[PDB]
């Protein structure tokens, strides 16, 4: 009795940091914008696997972002720690979505991100100062890739970096837990921490976005205290984990494509385009593609019924050869325009240009200060995170030429 199914298990795990899982390549190749999958609990759901259809469905308000809905597509038991939890605007639909998102946009404008560049460069070179002073070997994740965005997002939020070991540990536990209880505990750890910060700011107004939300919107009853906690937690976790993963995966990927890494070093005007290509190619945030239909939607002859879960798999859409010629070739010179690594539409990543700024500063700094950087272990020996979380590696051993 054959085991072939027409609803393969989803998600799949990467076997190479920068390649689609074998099962995803299969979905990429199968014609049609949609494909059935089976989630961890046996429920069937749709995945979107082509680029233009992914944009269209991300733009369709009939695909709700409401994670509290019973039919929202959960890809791991740990999701249940989010289904029964208060809801940042990543999980809201218009019109509620806009009222909450606009409370935070002032910290992520182009003018603010520009103003942050000297501060980001200082943080980047500070952690490189310390890592290089100590000499190889080092774990790039714990010594550089994680602390840099953590320090940056703490200052943006007004979260004291002195507490970094606490919330770095909680952030990891929340995002990578494979059971609801572990994720729920980390959620509650972070919430209790953030609730105390709020009360402190009500005594002594503080800097940063959390300080501003306490002094203004909270004081005016325009955001619930618990929504403020959920909102700060979203930005804190998003600010830590995603950028850190782009750094480690970009280093791995660039060292596996030395001709392009050399071309990048030789002409730094290529770095912004290289960042876009790396974002398209590494597409680390499929876990951010879940949707639930609130009405029937006809998609190129296929029918999404009201109440069905839909996952917009931007990593697969980003390998659509009708948009990106030879889509599985890394090409830092190609047009990676219109990639979906940050989503599309009303929920397109609030932090996208901070992430672009941090990756540019980081790649230039590594090429400037550590041109002899190389992995200290074979790529095959790295441990990749599973497809139920943000893609990446939890450790990245590196070495380099030690200058005394
Ligand atoms: C390379 C790094 C990053 C990637 C690949 C990424 C990816 C994404 C994606 C795909 C979405 C859309 C989710 C959806 O449609 O439901 C999203 C939304 C979001 N991201 Fe990021 N992100 C990154 C970095 C950041 C950073 C540094 C922040 C800083 C706070 C951040 C904050 C957010 C927020 C707040 C949202 C929700 C926006 C909304 O619902 O209106 N992200 N991100
Ligand atoms: N989607 C998404 C996304 C997230 S980071 C915070 C994640 C989270 C997971 C489980 C429980 C609570 C929370 Cl708050 S969900 N992200 C990543 C980059 N930009 C946005």
Curated annotation (Swiss-Prot):
Signals that turn on the gene: By herbicides.
Protein location: Cytoplasm
Outcome recorded upon mutating residue 187 to A/Q/K: Decrease of the hydroxylase activity
A Pfam family: p450
Described purpose of this protein according to its UniProt entry: Involved in the metabolism of vitamin D3 (calciol) and of a number of sulfonylurea herbicides. Catalyzes the two-step hydroxylation (25- and 1-alpha-hydroxylation) of vitamin D3 (VD3) to yield its active form 1-alpha,25-dihydroxyvitamin D3 (calcitriol). The second reaction is the hydroxylation of the C1-alpha-position of calcidiol to produce calcitriol. It can also hydroxylate vitamin D2.
Protein name, entry field: Vitamin D3 dihydroxylase
Keyword Oxidoreductase in record: yes
EC number: 1.14.15.22
Keywords, ordered alphabetically: Cytoplasm, Heme, Iron, Metal-binding, Monooxygenase, Oxidoreductase
CDD domains linked: CYP105-like (cd11030)
General remark: Two metabolic pathways exist. One is a conversion of VD3 to 25-hydroxyvitamin D3 and then to 1-alpha,25-dihydroxyvitamin D3 (25-pathway), while the other one is a pathway via 1-alpha-hydroxyvitamin D3 as an intermediate (1-alpha-pathway). Analysis show that the amount of 25-hydroxyvitamin D3 is predominant as the product of this reaction, while very small amounts of 1-alpha-hydroxyvitamin D3 and 1-alpha,25-dihydroxyvitamin D3 are obtained, suggesting that the major pathway is the 25-pathway. The hydrophobicity and the volume of the side chain at position 84 are critical for the activity.
Cofactor requirement: heme
One GO cellular component term noted in the UniProt record for this chain: cytoplasm
GO biological process, one term: vitamin D3 metabolic process
Domain of life: Bacteria
InterPro entries the record matches: Cyt_P450 (IPR001128), Cyt_P450_B (IPR002397), Cyt_P450_CS (IPR017972), Cyt_P450_sf (IPR036396)
The reaction(s) this protein catalyses: calciol + 2 reduced [2Fe-2S]-[ferredoxin] + O2 + 2 H(+) = calcidiol + 2 oxidized [2Fe-2S]-[ferredoxin] + H2O; calcidiol + 2 reduced [2Fe-2S]-[ferredoxin] + O2 + 2 H(+) = calcitriol + 2 oxidized [2Fe-2S]-[ferredoxin] + H2O
Positions bound to calciol: 75, 187, 230, 287
The family this protein is said to belong to: Belongs to the cytochrome P450 family.
Stretches for region Disordered: 1-18
Result, substituting residue 175 to A: Decrease of the hydroxylase activity for both 25-hydroxyvitamin D3 and 1-alpha-hydroxyvitamin D3
GO MF terms, alphabetically ordered: heme binding; iron ion binding; oxidoreductase activity, acting on paired donors, with incorporation or reduction of molecular oxygen, NAD(P)H as one donor, and incorporation of one atom of oxygen
Sequence positions that bind heme: 97, 101, 291, 347, 349
Source organism (scientific name): Streptomyces griseolus
């Amino acid at each position: 009795t054959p085991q072939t199914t027409d609803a393969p298990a989803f998600p799949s795990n990467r076997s190479c940091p920068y390649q689609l899982p074998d099962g995803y390549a299969q979905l990429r190749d199968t014609p049609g914008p949609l494909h059935r999958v089976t989630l961890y609990d046996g429920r069937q759901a749709w995945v979107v696997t082509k680029h233009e259809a992914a944009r269209k469905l991300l733009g369709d308000p009939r695909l709700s972002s409401n994670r509290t809905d019973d039919n929202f597509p959960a890809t791991s038991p740990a999701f249940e720690a989010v289904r029964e939890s208060p809801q940042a605007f990543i999980g809201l639909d218009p019109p509620e979505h806009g009222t909450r998102r606009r409370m935070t946009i002032s910290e992520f404008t182009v003018k603010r991100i520009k103003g942050m560049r000297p501060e980001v460069e200082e943080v980047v070179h500070g952690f490189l100062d310390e890592m290089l002073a100590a000499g190889p070997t080092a774990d790039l994740v714990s010594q550089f890739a994680l602390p840099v965005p953590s320090m940056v997002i703490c200052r943006l939020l007004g979260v004291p970096y002195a507490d970094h070991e606490f919330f770095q540990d909680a952030s990891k536990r929340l995002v990578q837990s494979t059971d609801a209880q572990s994720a729920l505990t980390a959620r509650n750890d972070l919430a209790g921490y953030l609730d105390g910060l709020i009360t402190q700011f009500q005594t002594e107004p503080g800097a940063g976005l959390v300080g501003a939300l306490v002094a203004d919107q909270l004081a005016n009853g325009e955001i619930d205290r618990e929504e403020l906690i959920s909102t700060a937690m979203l930005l804190l976790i998003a600010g830590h984990e995603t950028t850190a993963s782009m750094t480690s995966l970009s280093v791995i990927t660039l060292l596996d494509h030395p001709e392009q890494y050399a071309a990048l070093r030789a002409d730094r005007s290529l770095v912004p385009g290289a960042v876009e290509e790396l974002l398209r190619y590494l597409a680390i945030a499929d876990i951010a593609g879940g949707r639930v239909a609130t009405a029937d939607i006809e998609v190129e002859g296929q029918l999404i019924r009201a109440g069905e879960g839909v996952i917009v798999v931007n990593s697969i859409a980003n390998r659509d050869g009708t948009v990106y010629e030879d889509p599985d070739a890394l090409d830092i010179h190609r047009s990676a325009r219109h990639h979906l690594a940050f989503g599309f539409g009303v929920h397109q990543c609030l932090g996208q240009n901070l992430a672009r700024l941090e990756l540019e500063v980081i790649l230039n700094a590594l090429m400037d200060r550590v041109p002899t950087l190389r992995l200290a272990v074979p790529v095959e020996q790295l441990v990749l995170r599973p497809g139920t979380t943000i893609q990446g590696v939890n450790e990245l051993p590196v070495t380099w030429h030690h200058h005394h």
